Amino acid sequence: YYGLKKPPYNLDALEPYMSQKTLESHWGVQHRNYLEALNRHLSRSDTLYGHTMDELVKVTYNYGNPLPEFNDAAQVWNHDFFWESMQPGGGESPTLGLLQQIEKDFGSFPNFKEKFIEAAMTLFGSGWVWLVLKRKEKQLAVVKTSNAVTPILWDDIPIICLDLWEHAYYLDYKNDRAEYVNVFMNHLVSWHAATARLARAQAFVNLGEPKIPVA
Amino acid sequence: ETEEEARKRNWVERGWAPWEEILSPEADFARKSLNEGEEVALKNPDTIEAFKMLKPSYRKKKMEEMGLTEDEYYARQFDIKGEILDPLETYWDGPLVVRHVAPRDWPPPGWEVDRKELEFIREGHKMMAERVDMKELDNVIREKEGMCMDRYKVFLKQYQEWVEFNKDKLEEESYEHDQDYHPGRRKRGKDYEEGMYELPFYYPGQICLGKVTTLHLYQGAFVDVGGVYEGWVPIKGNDWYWIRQHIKVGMHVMVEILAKRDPYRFRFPLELRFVDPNIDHLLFQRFEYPPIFHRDEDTNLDELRRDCRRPPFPRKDPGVKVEEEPLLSDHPYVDKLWQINVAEQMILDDMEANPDKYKGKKLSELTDEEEFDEEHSVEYTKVQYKKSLLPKTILKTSVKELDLESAFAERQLHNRLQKEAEERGEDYKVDKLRRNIEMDEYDFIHWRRSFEEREALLRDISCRQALGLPLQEPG
Amino acid sequence: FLLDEDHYERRKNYRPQYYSENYEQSKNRRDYYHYTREEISPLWHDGLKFLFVTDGTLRIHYYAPSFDGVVVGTEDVLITPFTCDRTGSGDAVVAGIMRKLTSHPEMYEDQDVLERQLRFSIAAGIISQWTIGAVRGFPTESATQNLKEQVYVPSMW
Amino acid sequence: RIEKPLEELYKIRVERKVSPERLNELGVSRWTTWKTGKCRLPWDWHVDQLVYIEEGEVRVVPEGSKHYMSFKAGDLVRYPKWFEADLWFNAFYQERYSFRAYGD
């Protein structure tokens, strides 16, 4: 039934940047409502109860034709990722491991920051922005998705996700995404979480060179 | 290029790997004596040894002077040659605090269980969300008993009855579908030891331990987890050149389930990754799609793909938009109305214009003349046009499907008008009868279907372009 | 036919789904199955002294009260494709078996002598297929011995 | 072993024996009608179609299949996008269809 996964910090941890009421509404009401709808939908079907969360997301989204299940499940997964993609008083420069990959694939941290801001600004409507790995090419890339679409659906491992829905930044920032995205990239991202996710993704994607024998 | 990148090309692309060859002493001498020349004195060291080792009595002298007795001098030629890697070391990431919850895919489809019992069980799944700190982990109760596992106990009772009932059925089916035994198949027959776990006992997320009982060069390592179905860690190609120096037969390892699959369709139903040791830094070639079974029972190749969730067979792009196109106006039933209408007039004009042919014209209740069957119509008849024999159409339209009463009254009404119009000369306005009105009506109904289907595409194309969903189905 | 036609026809036409077993199974040669003494048991009784199963002239399986085995032979009718007629070869095989049984009375309890003397019958059966007519071309003893010595290695004969 | 019904394989969601409360919320009354007899209609749906067969049968066969599904009065078939079926009609058949795009 996938009970609520608590964020790794209290609802007032990010008060100077994300208001306590914003955390109470985003997680207490919205995420809980999505999960409750998913629970009601899971009660009926029994072939969807035997599916993992990733399998449920990947199956209820058909090959382009979502069932009356994709929205709620994908929203629940995306919000889990979003909550786990922060840390109190975090941000700033990255740490070892991730920095070399970003520099190799993007060029420098400021380059990544500019590309992330630009790709967040070029979204219309409600959606999410992502920094994900890419299989079959092994390269970090900034990607964009609309509504409740996730980069998982085409064999991409998400590493960082940012909510661009208007229901996130309206209690304190009203009608501008510049302040919201700048605050997220400055004092809200969790390079520890991104590093952990990249380390886990290293199991399924090999970012390295083989040890060829001299022979 | 040089032999540092060109050699690299063979490994990464063409799968080259310097697998060691176990040459017999007769074949060993050939490789170490053909470098010098055709027929020259053999003065090269390590070549005289090969020549001197052709005598078995000298091999006995060599081994005994080094020792190792027998049965070990034979086994020392199979050793890996080259860069012998330093041995594995497996760290961890903290305590292995675990829950004990029933697998989600319970009960199996077809099995019947009281839903109230499961509604109590399913609360265990909903509890796999809270996290645990090192605080409250120092408060280990440490009393060896009094474990509050209750929902898992209920699942064990239900699972235990399931095993004792369907075991005979399951073993019979495995003897029916799969002919021979391969790792990843049902452990049937003499190899079935009572007490093995079944497939429903497993689920992704669980961390297991087992022994490595089989290494396959093209499939990976098969670890006996403890069930009727073995595990499968996908390792292929030349990755085994380094991995084989870490994983050996009989090793006890700790694994985690990534995904369990249907044993009937997918070849290896259990997929695992090595948690102890960790060889994630050595794996480079990975399976894009899990292996499956292509059985004779699968008659349609477009149902097989939906079973395994594989991309369909691509079709060459026609290039047309399929958005602006002639709307369909034909109707399937019209091609039978043409046969029905023709049969009416073929019998009518042979009944009223020539009434004496069939004495009485009782078309209000007329019965059939010849026995008719629905599933035969081969009417082509080799119709000749004074040139050659080319097929035409004269098909069977037995009166069972024929409604003569409607046309019987109508033709007399039309025949009255033509005989009364010879005098005054009024234009005989007869162009459409009852059947020919149904032809245009049914073509109108099919037009409405094709009208809205093209109408809904206008909104559908716009929606899938404002968001990003595909327009043409993948592949 | 006397034991089970369907079972012994399904067993003959069988190839493994994955991998062979020894190596000979990986060559798809002909099936020369040597029936075990527990399969021919329903056709066995106390008074029996010998059971012979002939797969043409190719092989002869012999079963005795205390031992059993198979004698290996060959055939060739394409050596003379225009004057080949298999009719009457089984009679020659049986006649050679009887002749060697009566000539050598020690074949009953000596497996080596039994195997050595059972190749004469195979040679006779091979020769009998090289001519048209059952009684026209039955082989002579000297011709049978000549073919036995020409086909079989000196160690066997 | 039960093979997965061809009904669900293509993700066709059928509601056999529809209750009357369901229909009024869905408004099947204002749906364009379609009818036929002994027929065989091959179609290549580009849009989702909600069907309310009123009398008859369909015996739908997907393209290339050697099996068939079957339907009758009181169904709510949901033939999906990009489907390629081979509807084989026998006797009279009536229906109400309400082609639907992304949403609702």
mmCIF file of N, CA, C and O in Angstrom, chain C residues 21-57:
data_model
loop_
_atom_site.group_PDB
_atom_site.id
_atom_site.type_symbol
_atom_site.label_atom_id
_atom_site.label_comp_id
_atom_site.label_asym_id
_atom_site.label_seq_id
_atom_site.Cartn_x
_atom_site.Cartn_y
_atom_site.Cartn_z
ATOM 1 N N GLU C 21 25.200 -34.664 -23.942
ATOM 2 C CA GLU C 21 25.523 -35.285 -22.666
ATOM 3 C C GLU C 21 26.973 -35.730 -22.569
ATOM 4 O O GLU C 21 27.650 -35.403 -21.590
ATOM 5 N N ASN C 22 27.474 -36.471 -23.555
ATOM 6 C CA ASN C 22 28.842 -36.973 -23.522
ATOM 7 C C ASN C 22 29.706 -36.371 -24.624
ATOM 8 O O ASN C 22 30.706 -35.712 -24.328
ATOM 9 N N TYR C 23 29.310 -36.560 -25.885
ATOM 10 C CA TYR C 23 30.002 -36.088 -27.083
ATOM 11 C C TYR C 23 29.434 -36.831 -28.282
ATOM 12 O O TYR C 23 29.197 -36.238 -29.340
ATOM 13 N N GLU C 24 29.224 -38.140 -28.122
ATOM 14 C CA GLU C 24 28.591 -38.925 -29.174
ATOM 15 C C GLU C 24 27.176 -38.432 -29.437
ATOM 16 O O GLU C 24 26.716 -38.421 -30.585
ATOM 17 N N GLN C 25 26.468 -38.025 -28.382
ATOM 18 C CA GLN C 25 25.156 -37.416 -28.553
ATOM 19 C C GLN C 25 25.228 -36.110 -29.326
ATOM 20 O O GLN C 25 24.211 -35.664 -29.866
ATOM 21 N N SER C 26 26.402 -35.486 -29.389
ATOM 22 C CA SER C 26 26.591 -34.242 -30.118
ATOM 23 C C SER C 26 26.946 -34.466 -31.579
ATOM 24 O O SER C 26 27.254 -33.503 -32.286
ATOM 25 N N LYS C 27 26.916 -35.714 -32.046
ATOM 26 C CA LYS C 27 27.187 -36.022 -33.439
ATOM 27 C C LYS C 27 25.971 -36.531 -34.196
ATOM 28 O O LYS C 27 26.049 -36.680 -35.420
ATOM 29 N N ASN C 28 24.858 -36.793 -33.509
ATOM 30 C CA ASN C 28 23.600 -37.187 -34.143
ATOM 31 C C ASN C 28 23.777 -38.418 -35.029
ATOM 32 O O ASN C 28 23.229 -38.505 -36.129
ATOM 33 N N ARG C 29 24.555 -39.381 -34.541
ATOM 34 C CA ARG C 29 24.734 -40.639 -35.248
ATOM 35 C C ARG C 29 23.461 -41.478 -35.143
ATOM 36 O O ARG C 29 22.475 -41.090 -34.510
ATOM 37 N N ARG C 30 23.479 -42.648 -35.774
ATOM 38 C CA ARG C 30 22.325 -43.529 -35.710
ATOM 39 C C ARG C 30 22.161 -44.089 -34.301
ATOM 40 O O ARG C 30 23.103 -44.135 -33.505
ATOM 41 N N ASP C 31 20.942 -44.520 -33.995
ATOM 42 C CA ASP C 31 20.591 -44.986 -32.656
ATOM 43 C C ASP C 31 20.701 -46.505 -32.616
ATOM 44 O O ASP C 31 19.832 -47.215 -33.127
ATOM 45 N N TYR C 32 21.768 -46.996 -31.999
ATOM 46 C CA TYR C 32 21.965 -48.419 -31.736
ATOM 47 C C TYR C 32 21.833 -48.613 -30.228
ATOM 48 O O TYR C 32 22.822 -48.583 -29.495
ATOM 49 N N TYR C 33 20.603 -48.815 -29.770
ATOM 50 C CA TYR C 33 20.321 -48.931 -28.348
ATOM 51 C C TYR C 33 20.463 -50.380 -27.908
ATOM 52 O O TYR C 33 19.868 -51.279 -28.510
ATOM 53 N N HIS C 34 21.250 -50.602 -26.859
ATOM 54 C CA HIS C 34 21.432 -51.925 -26.273
ATOM 55 C C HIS C 34 20.461 -52.057 -25.109
ATOM 56 O O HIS C 34 20.669 -51.460 -24.048
ATOM 57 N N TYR C 35 19.399 -52.832 -25.311
ATOM 58 C CA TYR C 35 18.356 -52.958 -24.303
ATOM 59 C C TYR C 35 18.906 -53.631 -23.054
ATOM 60 O O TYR C 35 19.641 -54.618 -23.138
ATOM 61 N N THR C 36 18.555 -53.090 -21.893
ATOM 62 C CA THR C 36 19.011 -53.655 -20.634
ATOM 63 C C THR C 36 18.203 -54.899 -20.282
ATOM 64 O O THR C 36 17.093 -55.114 -20.774
ATOM 65 N N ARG C 37 18.778 -55.724 -19.405
ATOM 66 C CA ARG C 37 18.147 -56.983 -19.028
ATOM 67 C C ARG C 37 16.838 -56.792 -18.274
ATOM 68 O O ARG C 37 16.069 -57.751 -18.160
ATOM 69 N N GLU C 38 16.567 -55.595 -17.763
ATOM 70 C CA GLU C 38 15.310 -55.328 -17.081
ATOM 71 C C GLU C 38 14.202 -54.885 -18.026
ATOM 72 O O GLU C 38 13.049 -54.787 -17.599
ATOM 73 N N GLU C 39 14.521 -54.615 -19.292
ATOM 74 C CA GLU C 39 13.499 -54.303 -20.284
ATOM 75 C C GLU C 39 13.046 -55.543 -21.041
ATOM 76 O O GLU C 39 11.862 -55.669 -21.373
ATOM 77 N N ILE C 40 13.972 -56.467 -21.322
ATOM 78 C CA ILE C 40 13.626 -57.731 -21.963
ATOM 79 C C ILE C 40 13.189 -58.788 -20.959
ATOM 80 O O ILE C 40 12.935 -59.935 -21.353
ATOM 81 N N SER C 41 13.101 -58.440 -19.677
ATOM 82 C CA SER C 41 12.675 -59.407 -18.669
ATOM 83 C C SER C 41 11.299 -60.009 -18.937
ATOM 84 O O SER C 41 11.144 -61.224 -18.724
ATOM 85 N N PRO C 42 10.277 -59.260 -19.371
ATOM 86 C CA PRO C 42 8.990 -59.907 -19.682
ATOM 87 C C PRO C 42 9.083 -60.981 -20.753
ATOM 88 O O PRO C 42 8.232 -61.877 -20.784
ATOM 89 N N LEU C 43 10.083 -60.923 -21.631
ATOM 90 C CA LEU C 43 10.277 -61.926 -22.668
ATOM 91 C C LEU C 43 11.326 -62.963 -22.293
ATOM 92 O O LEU C 43 11.781 -63.713 -23.162
ATOM 93 N N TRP C 44 11.722 -63.020 -21.026
ATOM 94 C CA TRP C 44 12.755 -63.928 -20.554
ATOM 95 C C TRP C 44 12.149 -64.995 -19.652
ATOM 96 O O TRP C 44 11.213 -64.731 -18.894
ATOM 97 N N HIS C 45 12.691 -66.207 -19.743
ATOM 98 C CA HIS C 45 12.257 -67.303 -18.890
ATOM 99 C C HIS C 45 13.451 -68.199 -18.591
ATOM 100 O O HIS C 45 14.540 -68.024 -19.141
ATOM 101 N N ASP C 46 13.231 -69.165 -17.695
ATOM 102 C CA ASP C 46 14.334 -69.972 -17.180
ATOM 103 C C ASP C 46 14.960 -70.838 -18.267
ATOM 104 O O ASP C 46 16.185 -70.997 -18.310
ATOM 105 N N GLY C 47 14.142 -71.407 -19.150
ATOM 106 C CA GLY C 47 14.652 -72.326 -20.152
ATOM 107 C C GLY C 47 15.439 -71.676 -21.268
ATOM 108 O O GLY C 47 16.104 -72.390 -22.026
ATOM 109 N N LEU C 48 15.379 -70.354 -21.390
ATOM 110 C CA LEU C 48 16.091 -69.665 -22.457
ATOM 111 C C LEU C 48 17.596 -69.811 -22.290
ATOM 112 O O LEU C 48 18.129 -69.716 -21.181
ATOM 113 N N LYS C 49 18.284 -70.040 -23.408
ATOM 114 C CA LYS C 49 19.737 -70.078 -23.427
ATOM 115 C C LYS C 49 20.360 -68.909 -24.170
ATOM 116 O O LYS C 49 21.540 -68.623 -23.950
ATOM 117 N N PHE C 50 19.602 -68.226 -25.025
ATOM 118 C CA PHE C 50 20.130 -67.126 -25.816
ATOM 119 C C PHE C 50 18.969 -66.317 -26.368
ATOM 120 O O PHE C 50 17.960 -66.884 -26.792
ATOM 121 N N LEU C 51 19.119 -64.995 -26.365
ATOM 122 C CA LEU C 51 18.185 -64.108 -27.047
ATOM 123 C C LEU C 51 18.975 -63.228 -28.001
ATOM 124 O O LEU C 51 19.912 -62.544 -27.580
ATOM 125 N N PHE C 52 18.598 -63.243 -29.276
ATOM 126 C CA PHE C 52 19.301 -62.499 -30.310
ATOM 127 C C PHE C 52 18.370 -61.458 -30.910
ATOM 128 O O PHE C 52 17.257 -61.785 -31.333
ATOM 129 N N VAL C 53 18.829 -60.212 -30.951
ATOM 130 C CA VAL C 53 18.096 -59.115 -31.570
ATOM 131 C C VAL C 53 18.994 -58.536 -32.651
ATOM 132 O O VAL C 53 20.055 -57.977 -32.352
ATOM 133 N N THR C 54 18.576 -58.658 -33.906
ATOM 134 C CA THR C 54 19.385 -58.238 -35.042
ATOM 135 C C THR C 54 18.805 -56.959 -35.625
ATOM 136 O O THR C 54 17.635 -56.929 -36.020
ATOM 137 N N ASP C 55 19.623 -55.909 -35.682
ATOM 138 C CA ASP C 55 19.234 -54.664 -36.343
ATOM 139 C C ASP C 55 19.740 -54.706 -37.785
ATOM 140 O O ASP C 55 20.679 -54.014 -38.181
ATOM 141 N N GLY C 56 19.084 -55.546 -38.580
ATOM 142 C CA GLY C 56 19.629 -55.853 -39.888
ATOM 143 C C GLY C 56 20.938 -56.596 -39.730
ATOM 144 O O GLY C 56 21.106 -57.422 -38.827
ATOM 145 N N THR C 57 21.883 -56.307 -40.617
ATOM 146 C CA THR C 57 23.244 -56.797 -40.456
ATOM 147 C C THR C 57 24.120 -55.821 -39.685
ATOM 148 O O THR C 57 25.308 -56.096 -39.492
#
